[PDB]
Amino acid sequence: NAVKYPELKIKLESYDSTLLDLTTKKIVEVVKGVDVKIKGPLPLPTKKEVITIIRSPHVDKASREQFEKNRHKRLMILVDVNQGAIDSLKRIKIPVGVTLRFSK
C-alpha cells in the first residue's frame, strides 16, 4: 500500500449549476467505491459578472437590458488517494462545462 499524494485539493467551477452538481455526485461515487475518506463537498461563493448593454442601436441610452454570467464554485480535498483511486480517476469523463483546478 502507498499514497503518493497527500492532500489532493480538487477545485471545481463552471458557468452552469446543475451540471456542476451532477459532476460532484459522479466524482464522489467513484472515490467512495475505492477506499478514500472524503472531507466533504463544500460550496464556495459564486462569482457573478454583470454586463450592461444599451438595447437601442443609435439613441435612447435609457433603454438598456442586462446580462449575467455566474461562476459557480466548489471545493474538494482528498486525504489519501493511492493507485487504486488514480487509475479509476482516469475514467471519470468530466462534462466540458465543468472546469477542474487540481492543485496537487
Binding site: 480517476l89 482516469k90 471519470i92 468530466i94 472546469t99 477542474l100 483546478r101 487540481f102
Partner: protein
C-alpha cells in the same frame, strides 16, 4: 545699492536640458510588451 542680479533663469533650467540631451543620446531600443510570464493553463484530469 543694487546687489547685482539674482535672476536670469537659464542656469537652473539649463541642467534640465542637459538631462534631456543625455537621455536622447542614451536611447536604447528596449521595446517590449509584457511583465509576468508563465502560469497560464486550464488543467485536465492529469492524463484524462
Amino acid at each position: 545699492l543694487t546687489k547685482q542680479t539674482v535672476h536670469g533663469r537659464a542656469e537652473k533650467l539649463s541642467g534640465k536640458f542637459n538631462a534631456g540631451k543625455a537621455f536622447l543620446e542614451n536611447k536604447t531600443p528596449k521595446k517590449a510588451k509584457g511583465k509576468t510570464e508563465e502560469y497560464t493553463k486550464h488543467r485536465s484530469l492529469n492524463e484524462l
